[PDB]
Design a protein around this nucleic acid. Structure first.
Ligand SMILES: [Zn+2]
Ligand SMILES: [Zn+2]
Ligand SMILES: [Zn+2]
Length: 279
DNA sequence: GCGTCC
DNA sequence: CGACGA
DNA sequence: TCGTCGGGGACGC
């Protein structure tokens, strides 16, 4: 079975995210456990935690269906030692809030060399940041998102994801989330079923589906190989609808959160139903 | 620099 | 993007 | 329901 949802708002409380997901009839959801544009946040209160867990129980969201996302400020491959340490600290905190919330997946972005260190070195830093985090927590898998390759951001080649995973000690708790907009922006074509085949055979060869732990289902406002990260609603961007029907019909994408991060939340319920109906 | 996006 | 502010 | 912060790294002016 497929779990199909959106990144919903956690304004006014994490439980609100589960409630908003149920309102759009999602069978999966993503959320930020704290604001993603700020370094600090108050510790989770027992009430926040219990309210969240109660909401997930009420609406039948198990941890296998929820894909929290970390902060935009964390750079796990930072070339500067103090900034790298702050990010590593922030990332452990994020993993710990997952532990507290009963969440078992944490989606994050690889990291960026800021043209101060080599790609090789940066990828190894990221792999080490992940080892550090897995060392201080239990039961939460580090899910690496592919990227569009904007600026000095790594993760735009599947080989990057493979190289980070090769550096992770406990491979039982690392995985990947593929974002279709980002893949398309990085040069992986999805505009026809045949191109989808090609792109996911490449993924299979380089990373392998055993590490696939989530998807972000985004059309692209940016163009093919542009290396620009700009989402669009399904069917309205440069990828088009065929890729999404193709993914819904392929059983390799079952049992993982499939998350819309499309740009018009007013149509997520309709995007979710359209995806469901493509199966 | 801006407004905007992720 | 979520908290907050009046 | 509106403007603001926040403050990392970008994009397209
Ligand atoms: Zn992301
Ligand atoms: Zn994404
Ligand atoms: Zn994106």
């Amino acid at each position: 079975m497929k779990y199909i949802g959106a990144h919903v708002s956690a304004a006014g409380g994490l439980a609100n995210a589960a409630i908003r997901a149920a309102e759009i009839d999602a069978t999966a959801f993503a959320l930020f456990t704290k604001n993603q544009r700020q370094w600090r946040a108050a510790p989770l209160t027992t009430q926040t935690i219990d309210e969240f867990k109660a909401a997930c129980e009420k609406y039948h969201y198990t941890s296998a269906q929820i894909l929290p996302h970390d902060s935009y400020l964390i750079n796990l491959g930072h070339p500067v030692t103090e900034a790298l340490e702050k990010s590593r600290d922030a990332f452990i905190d994020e993993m710990q809030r997952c532990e507290q919330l009963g969440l078992s997946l944490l989606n994050f972005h690889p990291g960026s060399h800021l043209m101060q260190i080599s790609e090789e070195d940066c990828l190894a830093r990221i792999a080490e940041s992940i080892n550090i985090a897995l060392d201080k927590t239990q039961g939460v898998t580090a899910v690496i998102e592919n990227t569009a390759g904007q600026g000095s951001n790594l993760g735009f080649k599947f080989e990057h994801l493979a190289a980070i995973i090769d550096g992770v000690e406990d491979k039982s708790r690392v995985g990947v989330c593929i974002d279709t907009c980002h893949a398309f922006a990085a040069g992986y074509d999805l505009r026809t079923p045949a191109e989808c085949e090609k792109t996911f055979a490449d993924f299979a060869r380089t990373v392998g589906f055993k590490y696939l732990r989530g998807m972000h289902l985004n059309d692209a406002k940016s163009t093919f190989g542009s290396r620009v990260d700009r989402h669009h609603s399904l069917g309205e961007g440069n990828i088009g609808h065929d890729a999404f029907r193709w993914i819904m019909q392929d059983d390799r994408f079952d049992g993982i959160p499939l998350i819309l991060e499309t740009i018009n939340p007013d149509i997520w319920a309709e995007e979710i139903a359209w995806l469901k109906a493509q199966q």
